[PDB]
Design a protein around this nucleic acid. Structure first.
Ligand SMILES: [Mg+2]
Ligand SMILES: [Mg+2]
Ligand SMILES: [Mg+2]
Ligand SMILES: [Mg+2]
Ligand SMILES: [Mg+2]
Ligand SMILES: [Mg+2]
Ligand SMILES: [Mg+2]
Ligand SMILES: [Mg+2]
Ligand SMILES: [Mg+2]
Ligand SMILES: [Mg+2]
Ligand SMILES: [Mg+2]
Ligand SMILES: [Mg+2]
Ligand SMILES: [Mg+2]
Ligand SMILES: [Mg+2]
Ligand SMILES: [Mg+2]
Ligand SMILES: [Mg+2]
Ligand SMILES: [Mg+2]
Ligand SMILES: [Mg+2]
Ligand SMILES: [Mg+2]
Ligand SMILES: [Mg+2]
Ligand SMILES: [Mg+2]
Ligand SMILES: [Mg+2]
Ligand SMILES: [Mg+2]
Lengths: 157, 114, 205
RNA sequence: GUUAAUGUAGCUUAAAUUAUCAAAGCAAGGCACUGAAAAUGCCUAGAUGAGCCUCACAGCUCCAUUAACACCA
RNA sequence: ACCUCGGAGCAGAACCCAACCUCCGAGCAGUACAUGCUAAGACUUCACCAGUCAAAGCGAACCUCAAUUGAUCCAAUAACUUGACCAACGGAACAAGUUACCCUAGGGAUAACAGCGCAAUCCUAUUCUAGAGUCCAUAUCAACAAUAGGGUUUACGACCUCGAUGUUGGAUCAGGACAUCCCGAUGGUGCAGCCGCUAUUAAAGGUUCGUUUGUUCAACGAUUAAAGUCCUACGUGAUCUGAGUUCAGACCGGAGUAAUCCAGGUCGGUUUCUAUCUACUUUAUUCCUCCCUGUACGAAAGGACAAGAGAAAUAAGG
RNA sequence: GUACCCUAACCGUGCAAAGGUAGCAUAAUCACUUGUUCCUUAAAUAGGGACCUGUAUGAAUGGCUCCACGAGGGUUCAGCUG
RNA sequence: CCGAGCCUGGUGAUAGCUGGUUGUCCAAGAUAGAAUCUUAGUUCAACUUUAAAUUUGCCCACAGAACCAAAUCCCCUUGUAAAUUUAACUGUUAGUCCAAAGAGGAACAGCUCUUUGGACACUAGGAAAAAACCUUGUAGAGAGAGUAAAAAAUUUAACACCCAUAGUAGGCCUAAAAGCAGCCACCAAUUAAGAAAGCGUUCAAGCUCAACACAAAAAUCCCAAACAUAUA
């Protein structure tokens, strides 16, 4: 048999006893290692600008709807001056204490859409809502005053 | 007049012992090819050498003469040079006539000289 | 020409004097084409072997098929086949001379870069089709990057200092400790146990 | 299969470097005109491809070509 | 084909170093004409023989080239000298074929048969997706390649046996593998059905008869559920055969002056044993007909399963 | 090397002492070879009749018909039989 | 029992070939070659043996050894006791495997050929049995002891969910090629969704993605038995 072969040639036993003694032995520690101890900053300006400016904010569960009809529910408030905003709860939920909204905080879980304005139409919006018998409106806030879905009936009538 | 080829496939080459014209080498040797054609029915054997590297490459040369008669017929390059090279035997026995006729005209004129 | 060019079977001047099977062009680390020149991705040889002309059409036809020649380009880092390899006409007894020249072959040592790639693309665009090219080579091969060739070098250099074994191969082989050079080759003083024939072992510190 | 030989103007041999004349074909040149005898030219990738020098020469890349051995158990 | 000599590589650096290993050469020519004579000391082709270099001295003067070759005896010549492609080149002074009519001595140092080694060749499986499959890599097939495994072939090798390990086919009896030809269960289908294609699992049982040929094969006729692939000293000749091969005779075609010869052909041609030892010598499948049903399936032609009844056949035991 | 329902070298030559005539023919005749074809058979590498270069047939190395004959060598009808 | 009878004689023919070669005990002892009608043999070397003579032998350090890798050669010191020369001859010159450097072959062979070195052709222990691998060589008796080499380790593949409007069938070439035959550009509507990354339609349609939102198989029959936990 030659020196360079097609197959891995067997070694001598004194060689193979040496290729066992000089194997790589890794360091083993005392204690195992693991067993021991712009996009946001612009939206850190915008919801702060939502709450400086707006008067009536309305929050909801708007993931409920189709690709055409959510453009339409956008357009059904386009005929007023109501605009509808979506924001990340990873950046909207910490702001609420920076604008001191305690009773609006245990309110933002899941998909949530603000429905801001400066004058309420929402007397007619519930009539627009009366043909989609889901999509329920939750608690709003006008000028540091919460208003629930009952609070949007006591004022809006 | 080339002999039309044969594919690399469709050739059931068996390898048997075959005829044995020898003492002990030729009973145990699978030297005889049985190179077949699958399409036609043309079965060719060969024990031409004591080696398949000249058996099989010459068995192929015989088969491309036999299956040539199948796809051409009696007008083929395998019968052209049977009727062209036995054309000469009518130009060899007729040639040999006309000189064994003029070898009596010169043999009777011989010795009828005086 | 932004593709792998055609590599011919034989040298244009055919080699007419026969050569010995000088098998120490397979054995050991490579000395030519170990580093990157004009590229970012390549196929490192983790073992020695001989590239016949069929491997050169394995490599060229399956790189020009799976590649954007507008955006990527490729370059041979081995030469065309030059080393003549004989074969005797079959059926013969031994002896009677050397055989006639059959075909040619290129010797590739371990650590050699074989085919280099480049252009505008990430490694993950090229790691796809190059790893399957590398598995059909006659040796162990591998797609590397510029970044993953140094990551394979600095990690293996880390393994030399990190290991807690007092006895390395290179210390026993040069000091001739147990009379061990009776068994070893004279090249194991310089191979240092990472090579055995044409095979390269990277699990050996 | 394996060595081994072979290649000549259109037609036959030459020539061991340098390529001939012998026929045929161009005519003209002695001769009344035809025949030679002359006096011409003429046609050879010297069957290939590369050039080692400078080569039908001395050899492969070569193409076809024929001989001959491919055995004993 | 080769045989003697030299240079280069293998054989990297003192020397040496084989090869039917790789590549080049040599069998001279040129110039002298002291290319006279002598003689310390060395070299040396692993021996001998041969072959090399050489200070000084005598006499004069003011060899080139890697090899460029041939011993002894003898023959020539008055002498000096000369004499071989003695190239089988350490050289016999001079001698070819053929043998199957053969002989003796040996050899497993050495072939054929078998075994064993190896796996180029061969077979197979995965890997890779190019390509076919109208489209679609993966129903089916599959290029260049890669990785394995097998031990059936043709090789190679020459390790056991030449004081004998007797063979092709057939007969007889078959043992075993499974890589399944049939019968069984399953997955896929370019699966409607019926047929098929492929894959996983299955070695319980089964695996025909003929004409030509010595034939295993192959072709062909008839069937079959199917007419498996191999291993067993190409299982099995102290059980058989002897057609083939393979002795002595002979013909033909050929080679050869002939004797004789040809993997040519063709007719003919003695197959021995009384068993010492081991071993051994009474442990159910399948097809068809009917039925379901001419239903389900399908546009129609076609045309199923499972369950059940009967008919046969082989096998086992009587 | 011109012969065309696959057919007039219809012409040039090389070499030799002479270039194989009649006949026969895939033969007991190198190979291809189980040549091609018809009969015979359910089926034919056998047998027989044909064709045919048979490139290695062939004329006292005797060639070709053919009568009888053969313990020759192949094929076969009918019978017949473990 | 005739390719040339049989007997007697020459004849104890010759055999480089086969087989055989007989008391006890001890010691030294193994493989460069070259010529050869020679490669089954022999002669000379080389190795070997005995006797004798003398003085260096081995191991080795600087310095040293050519231009076109391992090492060696040379070699004082040193550690050692051997070497050469002389005398007398025999035998062995048909070797193997392993490690290494190569050549041939297939980067086949228990293959063939050289080279350096081991071991075997001698003992004992181990690798199961075992010529060649490892341990160990100088002999006897012991119902003492300490050791040397010396026992194979391994067990692998799960994975996103949600959700999809739009300037337009961007233009080109095209029967029309619409995100996806092909070429250029690749901007842009809203908080966020590529002039579209795979399928798919002759073309479309449609389904998704990117986006915001929370390793195995062979022929007689498997092959020690078995075993995860008692302190080196
Ligand atoms: Mg000497
Ligand atoms: Mg002098
Ligand atoms: Mg001689
Ligand atoms: Mg000699
Ligand atoms: Mg005879
Ligand atoms: Mg032997
Ligand atoms: Mg054998
Ligand atoms: Mg040997
Ligand atoms: Mg024998
Ligand atoms: Mg015996
Ligand atoms: Mg199975
Ligand atoms: Mg047998
Ligand atoms: Mg027997
Ligand atoms: Mg008889
Ligand atoms: Mg008589
Ligand atoms: Mg005697
Ligand atoms: Mg002898
Ligand atoms: Mg003997
Ligand atoms: Mg002793
Ligand atoms: Mg000294
Ligand atoms: Mg050997
Ligand atoms: Mg002791
Ligand atoms: Mg998504």
């Amino acid at each position: 048999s030659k020196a360079v072969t097609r197959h891995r040639r067997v070694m001598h036993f004194q060689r193979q006893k040496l290729m066992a003694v000089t194997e790589y032995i890794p360091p083993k520690p005392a204690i195992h290692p693991s067993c021991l101890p712009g996009l946001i900053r612009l939206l850190r300006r915008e919801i702060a600008a939502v709450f400086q400016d707006n008067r009536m904010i309305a929050v909801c569960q708007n993931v409920a709807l189709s690709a055409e009809d959510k453009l339409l529910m956008r357009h059904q408030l386009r005929k007023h001056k109501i605009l509808m905003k979506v924001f990340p709860n990873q950046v909207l939920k910490p702001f609420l204490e920076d604008s001191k909204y305690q009773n609006l905080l245990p309110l933002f879980v899941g998909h949530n859409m603000l429905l801001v304005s400066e004058e309420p139409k929402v007397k007619e919006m519930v009539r627009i809502l009366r043909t989609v018998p889901f999509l329920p409106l939750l608690g709003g806030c006008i000028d540091d005053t919460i208003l629930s879905r009952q609070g949007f009936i006591n004022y809006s009538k | 007049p080339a002999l039309l080829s044969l594919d690399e496939n469709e050739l059931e080459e068996q390898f048997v012992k075959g005829h044995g014209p020898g003492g002990q080498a030729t009973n145990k040797t699978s030297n005889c090819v049985v190179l077949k054609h699958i399409p036609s029915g043309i079965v060719v054997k060969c024990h031409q050498t004591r080696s398949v590297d000249q058996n099989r490459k010459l068995a192929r040369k015989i088969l491309q003469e036999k299956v040539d008669v199948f796809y051409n017929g009696e007008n083929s390059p395998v019968h052209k040079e049977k009727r062209e090279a036995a054309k000469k035997k009518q130009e060899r026995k007729k040639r040999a006539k006309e000189t064994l006729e003029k070898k009596k005209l010169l043999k009777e004129l011989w010795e009828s000289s005086k | 020409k932004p593709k792998l060019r055609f590599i011919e079977r034989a040298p244009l001047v055919p080699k007419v004097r026969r050569e010995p099977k000088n098998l120490s062009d397979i054995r050991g680390p490579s000395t030519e084409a170990t580093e990157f020149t004009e590229g970012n991705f390549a196929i490192l040889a983790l073992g020695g072997g001989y590239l016949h002309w069929g491997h050169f059409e394995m490599m060229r036809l399956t790189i020009n098929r799976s590649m954007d020649p507008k955006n990527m380009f490729a370059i041979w880092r081995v030469p065309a086949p030059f080393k003549p390899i004989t074969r005797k006409s079959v059926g013969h007894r031994m002896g009677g001379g050397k055989g006639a020249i059959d075909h040619y072959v290129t010797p590739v040592k371990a650590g050699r870069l074989v085919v280099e790639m480049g252009g505008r693309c990430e490694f993950e665009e090229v790691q796809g089709f190059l790893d399957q090219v590398a598995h059909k080579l006659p040796f162990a091969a591998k797609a590397v990057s510029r970044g993953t060739l140094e990551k394979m070098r600095k990690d293996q250099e880390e393994r030399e200092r990190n290991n807690q074994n007092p006895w390395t191969f290179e210390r026993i082989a040069t000091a001739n400790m147990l009379g061990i050079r009776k068994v070893l080759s004279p090249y194991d003083l310089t191979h240092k146990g990472k090579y055995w024939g044409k095979f390269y072992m990277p699990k050996r510190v």
